[PDB]
């Protein structure tokens, strides 16, 4: 479906060191393209895709300054939330935030988001309208108030509606070669008698991009979703994905089962059987 630019911030307090650690990663679709880590010596925003290295020093200097500001304020923000929850300075706590723009067919924002979380529970979300906020609890209501007081929703809305989609279109051009081609899965079906009672059939998809994919098993027009084991889609290590679906079948019946593979990069859905 739609292309997207999104940032994932993680601030974690470190009571032993008496400080905090700030991580940023930036994504276009399912492809990481930048990172920051306040523990790196002389910490900078660093490139993590081929296509982003071509940006000039002014691009890296700004993203680095925002990173460092984000890291310094998020240290007090952790201290602020500790206060609202009456928590000890003995414990580590985490503050997450994610935000992005999806790209509508016209060249404008489709959907924009800006959510945060404290120890992995929703804290505040900006609503679809980009004009109001929703708060999870008493602490978050205090934070919601300050944001309203300072007309923060308009600044997020301006960002998501302008700069975010502007640079997302910019980035999809810069890495067109990688971000906008589909890699179909390389597929095969394996056979392992794992007991006396039943033979394991396993349908592999390897080296596919993007992440979205549909694995299913069939037998006489009958779907076997209920019976099959489907592993969590996992990275290949080179910017692609892999997945398998296994199902157990009676000995003698292996060639009666077909695996169905639907992915963006196939001319039309695939149909495999074993040997």
């Amino acid at each position: 479906g739609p292309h997207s630019l999104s940032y994932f911030y993680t601030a974690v307090s470190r009571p032993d060191r008496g400080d905090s650690r700030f991580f940023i990663v930036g994504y276009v679709d399912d492809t990481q393209f930048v990172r920051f880590d306040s523990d790196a010596p002389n910490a900078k925003m660093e490139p993590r895709a081929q296509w982003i290295q071509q940006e000039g020093q002014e691009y890296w200097d700004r993203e680095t300054q925002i990173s460092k500001d984000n890291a310094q304020i998020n240290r007090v923000n952790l201290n602020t939330l500790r206060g609202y929850y009456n928590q000890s300075e003995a414990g580590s706590h985490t503050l997450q935030r994610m935000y992005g723009c999806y790209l509508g067919p016209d060249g404008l924002l489709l959907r924009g988001y800006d959510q945060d979380a404290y120890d992995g529970a929703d804290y505040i979300a900006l609503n679809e309208d980009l004009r109001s906020w929703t708060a999870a609890d008493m602490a978050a209501q205090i934070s919601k108030r300050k944001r309203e007081a300072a007309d923060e929703a308009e600044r997020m809305r301006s960002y998501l509606q302008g700069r975010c989609v502007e640079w997302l279109q910019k980035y999809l051009e810069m890495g067109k070669d990688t971000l906008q081609r589909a890699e179909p899965p390389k597929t095969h079906v394996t056979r392992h008698p794992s007991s006396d009672l039943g033979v394991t059939l396993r349908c592999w998809a390897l080296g596919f991009y993007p992440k979205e994919i549909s694995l299913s098993w069939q037998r006489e027009g009958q779907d076997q979703s209920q019976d099959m084991e489907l592993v969590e889609t996992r990275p290949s290590g080179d910017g692609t994905f892999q997945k398998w679906a296994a199902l157990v079948v009676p000995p003698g019946e292996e060639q009666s089962y077909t695996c169905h593979v639907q992915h963006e990069g196939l001319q039309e859905p695939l149909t495999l059987r074993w040997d």
């Binding site: 930036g26 503050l95 505040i124 934070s143």
Partner: peptide
Amino acid sequence: YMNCSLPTY
């Protein structure tokens, strides 16, 4: 391109 403006807590 990151957001210049910081949300308050």
